[PDB]
Amino acid sequence: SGLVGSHMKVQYSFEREFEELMSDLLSKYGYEMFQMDGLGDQLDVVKFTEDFVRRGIIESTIDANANVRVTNISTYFIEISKPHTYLYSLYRIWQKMKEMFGKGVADEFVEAQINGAVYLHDRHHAALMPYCFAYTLKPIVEKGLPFIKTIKSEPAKHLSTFIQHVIQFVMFASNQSSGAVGLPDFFVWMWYFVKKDLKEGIIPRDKLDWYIEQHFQILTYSLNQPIRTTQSPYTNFTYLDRNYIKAIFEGERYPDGSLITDHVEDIIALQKHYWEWVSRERERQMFTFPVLTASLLYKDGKFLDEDSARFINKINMKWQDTNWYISDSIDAVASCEKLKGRMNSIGGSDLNIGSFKVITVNLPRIALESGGDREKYLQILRHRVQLIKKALAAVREIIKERISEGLLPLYENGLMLLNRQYGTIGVTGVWESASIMGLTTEDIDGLKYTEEGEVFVDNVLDTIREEAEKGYHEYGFTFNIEQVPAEKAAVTLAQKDRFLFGEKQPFEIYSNQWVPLMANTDVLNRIRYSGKWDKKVSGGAILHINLGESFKTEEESFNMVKMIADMGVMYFAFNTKISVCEDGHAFYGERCPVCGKAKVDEYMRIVGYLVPVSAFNKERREIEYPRRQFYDSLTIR
Amino acid sequence: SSGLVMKVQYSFEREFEELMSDLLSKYGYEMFQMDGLGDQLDVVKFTEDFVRRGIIESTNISTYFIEISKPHTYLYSLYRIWQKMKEMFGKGVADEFVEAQINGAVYLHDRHHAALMPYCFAYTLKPIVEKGLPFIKTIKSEPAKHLSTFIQHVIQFVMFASNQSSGAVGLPDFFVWMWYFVKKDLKEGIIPRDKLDWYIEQHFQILTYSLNQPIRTTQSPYTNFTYLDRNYIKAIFEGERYPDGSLITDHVEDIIALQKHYWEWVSRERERQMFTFPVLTASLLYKDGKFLDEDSARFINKINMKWQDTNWYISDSIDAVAKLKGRMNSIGGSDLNIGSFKVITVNLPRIALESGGDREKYLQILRHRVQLIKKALAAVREIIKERISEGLLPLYENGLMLLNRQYGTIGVTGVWESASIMGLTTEDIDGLKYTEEGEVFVDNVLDTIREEAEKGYHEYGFTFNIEQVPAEKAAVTLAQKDRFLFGEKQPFEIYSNQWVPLMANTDVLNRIRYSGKWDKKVSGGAILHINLGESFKTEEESFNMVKMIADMGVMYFAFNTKISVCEDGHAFYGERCPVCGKAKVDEYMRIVGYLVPVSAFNKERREIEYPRRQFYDSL
Ligand code: NA
Ligand SMILES: [Zn+2]
Ligand SMILES: [Zn+2]
């Protein structure tokens, strides 16, 4: 095995049954199928490398923002092995599924993954490490960095060291997981060190706000200055309102013995300070992270912390850079077994909640297979979701093996908690699925579901809920549902379906909101749909409404926020188009009010967080129109 | 076509495939397995072995993603180098290098990276202070205005640079630039002047622990600090200015004081927690029997009394730091703005084995092989130039790494074992030593490589240096390859990385004399350890020994005393921790010149070599 007159090959040690499965699938679907799935010539290390190193001049040729987007060698070492660790992960999942459920089930999953009936997320990591978690910093504050075992670090005594530890933890956790590193209680723990150092005279009183903002700066820029690749780890902050702070931290104490809930007003004030500082800082330099969410308790037409709500509403007026999380209860988070707690891939996941893996069901595929028959549709859907549950159970078993092998110290040190992680049934292409079924229309209010289309979506989501609920008793852990961001999946699934079904599949990309971001429809329709269906996925969705112009008054904005909250929307944001100049100043319009230079790019929420449009398009190009194999003077031989 | 076809097919020219097939026929699968080109490329087997390793014996998942691709990017690099050498020198030369690399006649360092990024550099922080983090293009970072942001930028730069290169990130002028921000923050009332030293030390702590708290893998980036003596500070920074416009040389005493503060802080900190990085070197100008900066020399001598944790760099001139000149050393002490883009080492014991004892044949083989190494270095350099033009190596674009300040390095290892196989080593009343003709032999070997290195500048348009490389793993690997090829003719389990092996018992004067003779031949590309059974009694005794060693011409050396650690990481001497009372469970030792746990030594050094290292009872 490994490297094996002339005609050098590389041989991986697969069970013969798996080789036979893969050979049979290639004959059935064709080389193009495997190529589309990333299991074609992507495993050619020589071709991969020669293509990679040649991309620069191509990007310079076609992209005005190439100079900002330019890839360096650190990306090479991350990308080169992804097709190989995906192939390994697919194989290992097949082995585990065969072990648990028999070869029939294992074979069916591999076929569904390759042909696009399902979408295994973070597939290059899937048999190696878990997806995501929203952490509490309590163990960092109390234990230091115990997951780093080659040196013993003392817990922070001061603000500077606390900030260092948080940055290091973020960087560490981002290499132990595929997804977001959430820090919803950051300001709870930062406040402790601000006060401690103030009391001790470490922070001069007359330099208090300066010291605070210096550390805001150090942490925030660190989370937007990537060491490897051209992208920072995905991080989340949450503005916890007074209800959430009181509920989550009831009875909990700081290292000095004081009750955390005795400090609520100070924690709120520090959060407000950050939100204000961040809004100011964007004009100095635009950045993405941490993704901002505010978590508000809202009930019977009222915010229970109206002071915080009006604050968030006010600060958002500038950039609309904060996502609104609305909940009608703090029961799930009270001083944090069937798992309860919001899980959302964009932001707003509750403290100590995560997902070890998402596998998404291709809903348009099922529409294509059903031929318009809604009963047939639901039968296929239920079977697919049952298959996905088995795959998730297998991945969880593999994760447990990795834990036992000492490979995932975030679990050993109690930062990531497996019994606080869902297995996620993802959905995408809800709209396109209904469209193919003949269940969408256009009337005076724009694009919408037909009356039967709405029932159909109800039935789809309710069917998945039922299977998710059954999964708990079946597999001993909790399943959630998410309408996933699908930055790549929305493209690749559409492409696979077009390969298989031709012109029956008319869409270039599948949607990640109940109505497509770029559908011409009345905003009331969007809100109504999110009000109907957000609750069905327990807040695993986002609604974001593009605004042509910022709100004129805080009052107008706030009335809209309350109306959306009244309708039952659980996570939403307003979208503005933010201009940047070549110097990175954020503003609106074509000319920078700071340096007078022209706009060269835009920041926008496309899947739920603010990114440069040039970054979106470059990534989109890389998967949407894959290059044919070409040769030059060297690579022709 | 290519990729997954089930087999995986890489796109190789047929000629390369035929060569590899021929080499497999000649040497056998065990040769490729030894070289890391056998079943290491089996991603499934590699992965299962990796993850189940903790289960079936007696590292976390981030190490997996680094290790899994190394056999593949080595294979790619070997191929790309073969292509480039074929282009530049013809197929015969390209083929010859590949054979030499696979069979162990030469040793391509950082082989998994060799066609992708360069080896090392000792940076000035001037571009960081003046321009911030310009190599990060996705955000524009303002230059630091305060000490806390300066420290952040240094940490980020180290982490960034460690992913743009294979080897050390040297920071020889760190304290020159740190001083500027210490002064600045004090003036602007950022620091309660009552807490000035606490404040400085807080930043010492944040920087130092960050550089010993690995985010990925079990090991931090390799970093170097240098205590620049007053001569070096004046020479290097003549005419240079801080951002406020003041002359740097107007602050020599302040910079010296800050350096001393760090060295003192470090020495105290090891009691709280033992750490490796940054590797500490002191650079001293020494001429005609005296330190020109005696204050600094006596300081280093004094602070070293506790842990001997600082390496001595000795030079008789500051001309090179005032056709590339300047010291290049893989362990520490590389001069400011000096690096190497790649090292390729010649296996000297292999040549001894091939020569059959014929010294003229030996030197003929040596000169041909060094000439082959120069061609391979030239090819690697052209590939690095390609990567630069492809926008992949931003440290070059941003003037942090400078290609015209990097050597191509001809490495040497196993000088001693090579001489031994030739019959030129003996045992006397004062222990193991080269014979008289053995010394002449080593002169001839080094002079031969020196001649070729010098010729290389006219031949290839860049400068070559020589280093007796640390060879942490190479010293084992090459010995094992030679054993496979030559059997009982090759008696050594590991080759030597010092002029006389650490594990050979000899009078200390012999070690010093050899280093005194030959360090200059490799322009300081070597290290000497003097292993001590116990700490020096007095500072005067220690300082007399240091001056004697400097007098003899030794250019880079350290004393070693075994440092104990308990399970909680406290450093001490003896069997019981004076801090927590727990038992010693491990030892720190220079593996080659930097202090690491003995348990972290690679297996062969841990079991074969380290236990046999000579320690001196008296000097
Ligand atoms: Na993902
Ligand atoms: Zn501007
Ligand atoms: Zn102890």
UniProtKB/TrEMBL annotation, chain B:
Q: Where does Zn(2+) bind?
A: C566, H570, C577, C580
Q: Where does Mg(2+) 2 bind?
A: Q205
Q: Where does Mg(2+) 1 bind?
A: Q202
The record's annotation in Gene3D superfamilies points to: 3.20.70.20
Alphabetic keyword roster:
Metal-binding, Nucleotide-binding, Zinc
List positions binding CTP. Answer: Y107, H109, D110, A168, R216, S330, A471, E472, K473, A474
InterPro entries documented for this protein: NrdD (IPR012833)
Q: Name one GO cellular component term.
A: anaerobic ribonucleoside-triphosphate reductase complex
One example of the protein's molecular function in GO is: metal ion binding
- Positions of dATP binding: E142, K145, H146, T149, Q152, H153, W198, Q202, Q205, I206, Y209, S210
User: Pfam family example for this protein?
Assistant: NRDD
Q: Does the keyword section mention Metal-binding?
A: yes
Listed under GO biological process in this entry are:
2'-deoxyribonucleotide biosynthetic process; DNA replication
Enumerate the PANTHER family for this protein: ANAEROBIC RIBONUCLEOSIDE-TRIPHOSPHATE REDUCTASE (PTHR21075:SF0)
Please report the name of this protein according to its UniProt entry. Uncharacterized protein
Q: Which organism is it from?
A: Thermotoga maritima (strain ATCC 43589 / DSM 3109 / JCM 10099 / NBRC 100826 / MSB8)
